Symmetry: C5
Subunit: 311 residues, 5 copies
């Protein structure tokens, strides 16, 4: 089999469509997602044209091996898509309506800067390499681009699924290449983070600040050290569910900042005790009393600054 011959010198327009059946396994560390979807391809092949009056048939069904099919690939896939041809239907003018169901593990980078309050744009790049006889160009049939109402991505809200209608046509290894961008806009469900990580982490930080109402060095050491160990456990638990970004993330920034509050609490607790021993409790008293107001105020302002910078 060979590709359809051009009437003049025009390139072959292959009309595409992706209808998402299932969305699953969004790996944050791997920056991957698994997809089960329909892929619809359409092009005109004059060699397949027929008379609908004489044949008595409106549509002719073919096997993939029987007719010429354009080699459509995905750019950002781990391995080649697991595909099963659903249908091939030819119209009297020779317009082929190909349909296949596929599953793929797609690599799409993620922006963790606003985590866990971040939104993403997942991509699926459709590509066709032009042949020596004639150039192939991709198009979007919006009537055949969509998603199942039941499509659910665990811990994520699916906003939109659209395609950038204008293909990215470019030279690659002395042959033409037509690329299409299928974009899946999603937003993270941040709810669980609040009672599981954020609030527990804040409560333990506030427990550390009860040392501003104590003169017992021994007890203070125990408070700050313990609550600090709990914070380390949270910092680790958090960093396990995220990849190593070459930038600061919102959660990361907050967590880091909290480490400084623990350091300064240790210093306060230390200074207070040194002074108490040095028979200067009145001076120690002023520092402890100031800390009671300073620590919450500076914590609140630092957070307002941080939130402003990130959002």
């Amino acid at each position: 089999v060979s590709p359809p011959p051009p009437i003049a010198d025009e390139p072959l327009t292959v009309n595409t469509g992706i209808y998402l059946i299932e969305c699953y396994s969004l790996d944050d560390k791997a920056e991957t997602f698994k997809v089960n979807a329909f892929l619809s391809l359409s092009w005109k092949d004059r060699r397949l044209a027929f008379d609908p009056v004489r044949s008595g048939v409106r549509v002719k069904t073919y096997e993939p091996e029987a007719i010429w099919i354009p080699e459509i690939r995905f750019v950002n896939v781990e391995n080649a898509r697991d595909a099963d041809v659903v249908d091939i239907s030819v119209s009297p003018d020779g317009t082929v309506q190909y349909l296949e169901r596929f599953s793929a593990r797609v690599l799409s980078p993620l922006d963790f800067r606003r985590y866990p309050f971040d939104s993403q744009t997942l991509h699926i790049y459709l590509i066709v390499r032009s042949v020596d006889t004639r150039n192939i160009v991709l198009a979007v049939d919006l009537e055949k681009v969509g998603k199942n109402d039941d499509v659910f991505l665990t811990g994520w809200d699916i906003e939109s699924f659209t395609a950038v209608v204008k293909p990215a046509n470019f030279a690659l290894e002395d042959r033409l290449e037509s690329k299409l961008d299928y974009q899946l806009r999603i937003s993270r469900q941040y709810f669980s983070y609040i009672p599981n990580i954020i609030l527990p982490m804040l409560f333990i930080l506030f427990i550390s600040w009860t040392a501003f109402w104590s003169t017992s060095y021994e007890a203070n050491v125990t408070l700050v050290v313990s609550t600090l160990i709990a914070h380390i456990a949270f910092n680790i638990l958090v960093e396990t569910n995220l990849p190593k970004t070459p930038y600061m993330t919102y959660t990361g920034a907050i967590i880091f900042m909290i480490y400084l509050f623990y350091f300064v609490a240790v210093i306060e607790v230390t200074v207070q005790h040194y002074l108490k021993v040095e028979s200067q409790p009145a001076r120690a008293a002023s520092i402890t009393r100031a800390s009671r107001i300073a620590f919450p105020v500076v914590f609140l302002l630092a957070n307002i600054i941080l939130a402003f910078l990130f959002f």
Copy 2:
């Protein structure tokens, strides 16, 4: 091969059945389950009809490639089902009886709101896409829908396996699709959760409350902080075995609530000591004595409220 032609204009009814052989690997985080089962398909194909007298046989066996077979798919599968055709048989009137054995990893969302005392309804959606020549509608042959008596799903009780007999017929990309809902009702075996998580977690909370019978700030700090660290360990262990839900779960609610009891214990422990230092032990005495009754009472009532809201 082409589909059977209609006698009038009626759609082709494909009679389905699923007989569960093995149920395994119910992943809570992934919201998946693996299944090994028999799939049976039956439809009338007149072109295959024969006379028993002339042929000398009451049944005719064919190879899948030899005859027309409807393209039946599962909606909620990760990848295409690993299937092996068991038998194909034609009755004299042309009633095809197809059977295959398959294995699939099925995606079915789970409702963790009542965890670990929750019950689920797993789904298997059977689907058929109609062809340009004729419309295909799915049916359930209840005589061919069942499950092996030995079918066991680890940590779960299997209640029922039934099919919603009326198919969900809908338009998708200008072609009729017929969907069938195979429902597997299961209920979690909550037993292990009691001696492994619930009771240990309650015991450590009750240990924290022994600080209401102590005036030793240093000992109290040690109690509350330690028991709190143990609670964090339990909260982490729990959240590892569950996905991030955009809603509160029963276990989650309880765990969260317990964090507040730890906070108020710290406050009590702090206030008591401040007052002792302030040379006001009689006032601290009243607070500590009240706490001895208040903490259990408020804990019990809070739990009754919570259980009421969730169940």
Copy 3:
């Protein structure tokens, strides 16, 4: 290809054999094991009869596709067995000697009640479905059922590998089914559990009991809390290597019981201190002195009871 014809009305007897080459990956949580073995099959197909005078050769060798082969399956497998035909030998009478090497991940439930001192019976169910022309029945050729002397299952002792010679012949979806039970009896190597989990866990419990020789509330609090945290770590480590059973396991029971000893130690430690403060150390003394004998004695008796109930 069609099945062989009966001389009278008798069913086709397919002789079976399983020779275990490798046993590995016994997943306790999954209740699975991987197996590499030889599957032998032998039946008479007179249609393949030959004269070795004419044909030249005494025994003929066929390709699986060339001749009729019974559709033999495994009931309790995750996916279809990875099989590679070793040999197909036909003797002049038409007796087929089919040999194949396979690998499979078998699901066989496990009884954790006596863990880590439990023994299991792993199963491999061979099954054949009877066709329209004639019924197929399975048989065991004991001369072809065995295992390699080198077969080792890590952390387990392999006792026996036998087959229940009488097949379970039953009706299923209006057709006959012949099932065979290949049983692999194994017993857990409990050795490692003693120096790794049991003894460490006992020592830490005994450390808590040194609080019965101390009057220092602050030191006692530290003992019981610490050792309790160590016990939680052990309880977690243990429950990670085990599935969630709807029943109590021996290790589980012991671990749970130990939690009660920690609770009562906390109570003792609390009561002793309260009394000390209440200026009643002589009464506190009696309780502490009693506890020194009571805790070991009650621990020993409770363990005798528990071991009696479980074994």
Copy 4:
């Protein structure tokens, strides 16, 4: 099919090119990386030459099975590359231009000596085996060696992708083998390590040094022990993300060194207390005062020395 015959006695030059489409999954422990790329091969086959005038075509497209294709393999792959032929084109002089898209898991050893500030050189070894009829030699077509601008390797900066143009021609199993080295130079994004591991770990070490401003043995013990436990947690977290090297790594060296600072702090804390009890606080005072300067100074020098040795 047989290989092209030599015009004289010259070997067959197969021109190679690798164009990286996707780079992903760099496993540090496994010392592997997954790759999705184009493999472009080109050789001259005179048997396939044609005249453009009589043929009416400037180029001829073939199926892989139709013509002779050199058996090109990768040396350092886990399993054989998942490959799909894109396009085979023959020019009038018989210059075959082959293109295939592949995915492979490549094993390339990593040098962790300067971790997490290390740079690597990933390798892809292309190999061809010479046949009895003629010797086959590999060449690099630099015009066909490249990478996509979007190629991103998570937690790594991609520097270059080049090929060592001169092949390593050597004997293996009595046949000549031509090897080519495709090198991918990368450098680790060390950013995340600073706020996640390095700084937290330094802060906790500095917290232990507050014991040089305390005379409270009990408080000091609590400081050094706690901070030490936090350091152990960090050391474990670090060694989980790295393989077991038979050499010291930079992070490893630092971590190890810090353990010695903790040991000497314990000794100081111990000696100070012993002396305090021995009614020699003036001598203990000198040691504690010296330690305040000695510990940071000796720490800074130790780090300068270490950084010098490693960079």
Copy 5:
């Protein structure tokens, strides 16, 4: 195809060779290793003989399907080897030179008794089942047994790769079987274990012994308990990287022994305090002073005994 006929009654000698290309993924818990290697097979097939002066060609290249190839398998593999035939060459006299490249996951048991200072012997068992027409026997062509100079197994030193030249010929299921033992001698790189596990673990044990220079029960309790918790963390981290052996390992023995030192320290710390309270500090003094010498001495001697027993 049928096997080569015997000239007399002699068995068919198949000359084997394994040339290791890549060694990777040595799983200690699984007792597996992955291998990428060349498999060479050589046997005389007189039916394939040809004249050299008449035919012109000295060597004839055949496709695997075209000629008879012996069914060579690996005994100790998880699944069947992923193999790709590289070359088949027939000599004038009919000697066949077959070569294939394979990848396999091999199960070879490991002896952890001297861990992490242990050496292993990995095995690859080549096997051939004899046919009804003639017996097949395996041989080793040492000229074709080897390994790549670049072959690296992470955390291991590769000593030798040899084959036991005399095959293990035995009866199995009424047919002859010829087995060959390919042995890969390796030794563990124990370096990393010293700064990561051994030294940290020793240091924390020595920290516990500072309680012999303290009379502060409260401080002593904190020392012994803390350091004990750190030891538990190390014991767990160690047992995670090792399988459950029915025997004692060197590391296991040491770790276990250390638990007894912690127990006796607790007893010492307890007895010392009891005596202090009992107004007998002079007697407590003798015990504490003795412990200062006893604990290191007994620790050193116990280790000498242990090392002697294990090595």
